[PDB]
Amino acid sequence: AHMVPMDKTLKEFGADVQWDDYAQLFTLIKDGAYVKVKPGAQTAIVNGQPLALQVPVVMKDNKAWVSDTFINDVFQSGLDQTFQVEKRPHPLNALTADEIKQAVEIVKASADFKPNTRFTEISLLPPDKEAVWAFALENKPVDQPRKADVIMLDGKHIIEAVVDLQNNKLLSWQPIKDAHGMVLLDDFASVQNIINNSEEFAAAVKKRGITDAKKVITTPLTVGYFDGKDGLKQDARLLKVISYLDVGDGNYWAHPIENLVAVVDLEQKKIVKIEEGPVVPVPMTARPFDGRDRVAPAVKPMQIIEPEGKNYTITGDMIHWRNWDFHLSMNSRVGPMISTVTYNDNGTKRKVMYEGSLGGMIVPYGDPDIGWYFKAYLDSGDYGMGTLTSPIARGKDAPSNAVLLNETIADYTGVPMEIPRAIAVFERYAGPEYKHQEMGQPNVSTERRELVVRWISTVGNYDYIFDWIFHENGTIGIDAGATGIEAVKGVKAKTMHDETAKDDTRYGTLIDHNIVGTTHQHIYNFRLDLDVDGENNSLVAMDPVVKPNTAGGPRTSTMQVNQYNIGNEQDAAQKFDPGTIRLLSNPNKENRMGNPVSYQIIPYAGGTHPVAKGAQFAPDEWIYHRLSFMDKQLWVTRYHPGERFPEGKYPNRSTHDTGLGQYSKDNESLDNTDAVVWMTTGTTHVARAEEWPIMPTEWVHTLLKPWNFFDETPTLGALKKDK
Amino acid sequence: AHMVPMDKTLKEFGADVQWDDYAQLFTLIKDGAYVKVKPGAQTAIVNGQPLALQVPVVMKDNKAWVSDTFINDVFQSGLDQTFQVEKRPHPLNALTADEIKQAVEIVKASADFKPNTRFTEISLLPPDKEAVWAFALENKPVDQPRKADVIMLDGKHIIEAVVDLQNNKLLSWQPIKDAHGMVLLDDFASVQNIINNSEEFAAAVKKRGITDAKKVITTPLTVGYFDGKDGLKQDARLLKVISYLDVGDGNYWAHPIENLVAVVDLEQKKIVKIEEGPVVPVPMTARPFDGRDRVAPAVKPMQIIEPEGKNYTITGDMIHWRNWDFHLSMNSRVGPMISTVTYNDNGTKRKVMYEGSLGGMIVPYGDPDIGWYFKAYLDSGDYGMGTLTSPIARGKDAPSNAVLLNETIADYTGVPMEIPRAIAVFERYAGPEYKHQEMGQPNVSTERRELVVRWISTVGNYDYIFDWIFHENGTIGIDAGATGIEAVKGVKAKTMHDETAKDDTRYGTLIDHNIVGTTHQHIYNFRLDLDVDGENNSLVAMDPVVKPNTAGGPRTSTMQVNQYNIGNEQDAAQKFDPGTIRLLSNPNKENRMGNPVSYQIIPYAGGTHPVAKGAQFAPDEWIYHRLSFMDKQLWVTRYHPGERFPEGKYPNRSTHDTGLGQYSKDNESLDNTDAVVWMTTGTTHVARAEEWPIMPTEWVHTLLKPWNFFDETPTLGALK
């Protein structure tokens, strides 16, 4: 019959609720809805529009009371225009929960299916590029059935199946010989149980001082490939296990049990080997990072509000914002995928990017000791960054004016998993777009607005933030932030004055008593299928050079440019000099001045940590051999549908380069053809006490800028006069 | 009794007025005050606190009326705690209007003061550093009279005088032999006037297609020093003049009169030579940048509000924000100066920076032609960037939650000039400060806030934005943005398919029909007197290196660090490799772990245009020779009171390097001494059509980060 307590309900729904005692007004904020309501009023204001309420908000014992329908009447009203319904479904839409369940039903109906099989990935198998661009630009329907890619792990084997969701049938079943599978979430539990039951393992720990071996936390690491020097069989499904002590401070990462490595056979569910080094006492001091021993400082409120709704519209997975149109989807391996990106140039939708996403990433360490030598995280390839998405903490992880999207992926058992607040979309003020204060004249200034698409992924101890930034003037930015807890080594020195300090700090800084933050790099690779105003592009180099003055006058030198085409994949794989210009041009289309329409590629646009010049490894290192993507900053390959991971499709225990090394090996011509740009960027992380116990976010920036793509400043506005 | 109209009055006072008809409420915003008032209410809210009103707000014909005392009662109530009164003045407070007038009076009383003398600079002559740190850190009064540095231009002669403001006396009068003075504001008008009154000039312009020479706009440029190869005499006060045609589009910069240079003698006020090249037709197409020909698309509103006031307090020129405390003052040559910067580490204020400011900057061009070969702007040095500050456009140039400060400097006649909205102070959200989402646990996230101090200066065609950014965790950022109108060359080519195209674009891109944006560099230099937890510091290098594994096991290599001290100024002057680490350390003080407290210096933290790897000049170039600061990214010198400018005190037609080249020439020891860091950073600007007719803002970033300065994450908070 009833009504419900307002603050309980709203808080539960996820709306921010402000009560203004003086104005006697409630301000309710949820994603795209900015609502104003006064107790007793018969109307409420939603994004500047009046909404008739059946039942006014009722005030009581300082308790406001609302109808049980309030949320639907207000929030689901139709006055919030942020989200729109798609009438013609986009060909790249991810698999829906229904489609995921269907695909699992089809493979499970297969004669070859075993009960123990896990799903490493379930993803759309997309139509050909040409059909997708015709849909996006000419509204030409794709007359191809929806197919899924089903990748499973059967013990230690990988099988690849293709299913037709239209016709409900298995189109292919194929075991992939040689390949090892990525780590699955149940492996985390599995490893922990194996250690739990191990007799031998308890013995070892007891010897390093741990009484209660039940307080020991494990973490699974992939083993890499050392050509047998690690003394491990290539055949088996193995994982290395590092351990920490739980001291109850909420941070087991601060209590390493150094020089103790267990090797586990996952098919056999047993510890195959226990590598032990010298006994180093476990750092026991409590180091919570959650504020339990701290006083939080008082900070006055700051709110970012959009009282009339947002400048963007989301129809299905498509986002419209000013001149940009793009499609946003989610993948369990690499997270977000940005597709069919166009820029509306005075009425003409011009192609910019067919598809862009994280390619892959690596975090390699530089310490040679037993618990470290093999340590290198391939976060997306080995662990599934999409799967480990971290829900955005409203107002902290994203500003108060963001809209948060839920996304659906399949878990490892083939059941659809909805990730709440998976992606954040928000507009932000970014200084003046342009300005010119002509002496004695009125000022000319316009504000700059940026549209940010933010996604966070947490792999173990470390948290990564990725921002895709759309600038109104045609620029596209891609930023990567890193925060979280450092991977530390237990050491005997307390201070730099101790006898073991110099040996203890050879591979990292002493950041706490008995704790060293081992030196390592963060290397990110982005796969960008740019189609600059069409598919057929060319790679052009423009090197600023000082040349002799040959024209007379007092000057001895001039500033000139060395311009040349880069014709094949081998010449296009290179180190990036930020003093130079690299363009992807369309040789077939020119701007008003007769210059080829282009985009400028900037893999290194800055960062807050020392930059990674290349891989910090000798060239005889296996990791170095297996992952060539790490050492060059710019790669341009010819478009081939299945070439998508810099590190290769199955990097677990790979023995050679099946990634970028392979894609550029055949050295195809890049002359006026469909090219794919790969940008590698990263840092060299040398630690300091300021990053302990938790690391302040550190950022790296990359950029794509229009270069003679337009005929003039793109943000000047519509032409009032002529044609 | 009688009222005034709210909107008129409030808008006149600079407050943003918002009426909400649904709530029947007015929201009034002005800098630090966020006010809410209902018509007919007996009280109002100022930054979350109630205030009793003498007279309520009255609603007329849907016209509100306020008492005559409303602003003062509301805005000056004391509930807005943003600005506090300074009872004991900081010793670096800039000269007041009164002090400026007193200083001019004292030099004017001298028999040596010639009647048409102009002032290039009138600035505080500060006490010793030691006295100034004792004030800030122990409230020890500086008992030294306020003194001013008075620099005058007598004809083409420079004179430096020092005045004692308390005793009202001239302490020194020093003619400066050989120095040339900077360009003054009246120089812009002389030049225009001289050109317009010249017969010969008009004749020359007629030649180039111009009938009415009244439509010619000039711009003054310094000529540099070519050891007589430009055919100009060193004694003389010369300026070169470039011309544009006014076609009434409000953009004379888009209409160059190429290959015509007039050399003007300012003492004699006469064209001393007209240099002409080939006739190139003037680009006539209208290219306004002001929107007169455009219609902008509709945008929904976005507002940033701080309803309870700001987290910072401004007491006199001192800013208190979270753990930071610093002093802010204005200089006519370099603009803002940030001083006595301390970090309150759990109740102990620790020294970070005695003083920081723009040192100097330069915009040199790469074309050898008649109208370009000598072209190089030393904006602060030759023109005075503080003097040319551009008032911030509220809500556009700075966000809507900023506080805008007015600043006073002397103009070139010795009269105080107040610059309205000279500086913006604003807090901004900058993503999560840190985060850790432990699998199966509650998330740990904190918001990052940045305090920005923004200043804008416009010199000729180009506009510069400088941001000094304070992070809660101890990091300091310095960002430099560039926007405005590019300096273009008129050419015959319309498109790249024209015969002249190849020759026309040898030195710059064709960005419009008959217009080439000449290649040039933007080079900024910052002077930072860091005092890392005390004055006696050392420069330490930490180079990440790959070394063979000698520990055994399967790895062939390891990641190690090559660490060494850099002991003298010649060794400290270097190119910056962003893959390396450079620290200013206090060898005398260590953190909890036994590491020397330090600050990491990063001259290149990124940018949106290609980087300047050094000067894009041969080393035999005169400009190269005169300005050493341009080619190295990091300089560390021993602290000396008068070493302030990278380009030298008097760079107009200097014959040698009197800046950083000179300061580091004596090669002093940098071992456990008071050091000064200088950071050079910049870009190489190659143009494109997207920057024409107006250039979207491009930015460069620099950073200073604590490195073992603290014992742990500085933003965790105080231990319970």
Ligand SMILES: [Ca+2]
């Ligand atoms: Ca392409």
Ligand SMILES: [Ca+2]
């Ligand atoms: Ca290939």
Ligand SMILES: [Ca+2]
């Ligand atoms: Ca110093």
Ligand SMILES: [Ca+2]
């Ligand atoms: Ca010196």
Ligand SMILES: [Cu+2]
């Ligand atoms: Cu790291």
Ligand SMILES: [Cu+2]
């Ligand atoms: Cu420029």
